[PDB]
Amino acid sequence: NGDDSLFFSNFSLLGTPVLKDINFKIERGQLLAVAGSTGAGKTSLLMMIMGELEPSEGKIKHSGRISFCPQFSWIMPGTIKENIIFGVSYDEYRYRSVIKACQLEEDISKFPEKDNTVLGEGGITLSGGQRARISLARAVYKDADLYLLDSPFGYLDVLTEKEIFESCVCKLMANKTRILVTSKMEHLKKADKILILHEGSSYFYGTFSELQNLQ
């Protein structure tokens, strides 16, 4: 079903050049905000986390339990809907809510064939933020036990960046387990636990209150 806590104790054992001395907890339905300098090792950590909780070698895999959202918005050949679903069964109410929360409702409607507008090597090209919104919608649509969101906001104005964090990350995914690599202090205020990395090591693990008490 689910272990209410996962204790990671990587004291420079895995990915030694980038990651060194990271120790933290992840509990069900909590928003963990990974933050830190540029060379901290945020993406490396999400990748590390993933390679621990993943099925091993050649296993049937069936339903996958981790849902990853990379920085590099990916677009496979196929319709806007196919890209979001990504193999997973369609559900109109699950899909339409994910679209509205990821703020793609207006964008999809103006396009010619709407959800069936084909993307990739044979079809339409997309906006920088529009690719990032599809990449995020695809990740939040997948029902997974854990969500790794490496800088899901990019090429988005602070008006939509703070609206998608509020509607999608905090209102829609309120009960899912999130690990969100973020920068803005507003994201850190709404977080359940804050992990601050520095040059590959964990320097702070706690709440926004403890963080401001320490500084």
């Epitope: 204790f7 104790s9 990587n10 621990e52 099925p55 091993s56 854990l146």
Partner: nanobody, 121 residues
Framework: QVQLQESGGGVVGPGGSLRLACAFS????????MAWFRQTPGEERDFVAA????????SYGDFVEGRFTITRDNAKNTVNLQMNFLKPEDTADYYC??????????????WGQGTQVTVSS
């Protein structure tokens, strides 16, 4: 084709300490995650501890509250469970399981024979 064999069981006093140890054999230990369970006769099966393929990720039963620690030696092929502050109610047969599934939704594919631990007041 794997086979497991626990050891370290015995009878310590109330508020004691004991170190259980299983033996993975027959395949690459590194590919499997481990787990510890217990069976207090008459009561339900209880999840005790679980450890990832590398050993960087662990998770414990709600009843441990900090007392037990799960470790592994991928070179010597063993998973160890260090139990401290054992209260009499922790008396049970401790089984060790190994799987090669997702760590979030675990499927305990293989099991051990169980070693008896007893906390005699």
């Amino acid at each position: 084709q794997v086979q497991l064999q626990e050891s370290g069981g015995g009878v310590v006093g109330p508020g004691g300490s004991l170190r259980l140890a299983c033996a993975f054999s027959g395949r690459t230990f590194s590919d499997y995650w481990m787990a510890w369970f217990r069976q207090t006769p008459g009561e339900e099966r209880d999840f005790v501890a679980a450890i990832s393929r590398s050993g960087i990720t662990t998770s414990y039963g709600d009843f441990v509250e900090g007392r037990f620690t799960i470790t592994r030696d991928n070179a010597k092929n063993t998973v160890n469970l260090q139990m401290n502050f054992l209260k009499p109610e922790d008396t049970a047969d401790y089984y060790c399981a190994a799987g090669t599934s997702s760590f979030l939704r675990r499927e305990y594919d293989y099991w051990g024979q169980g070693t008896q631990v007893t906390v005699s007041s």
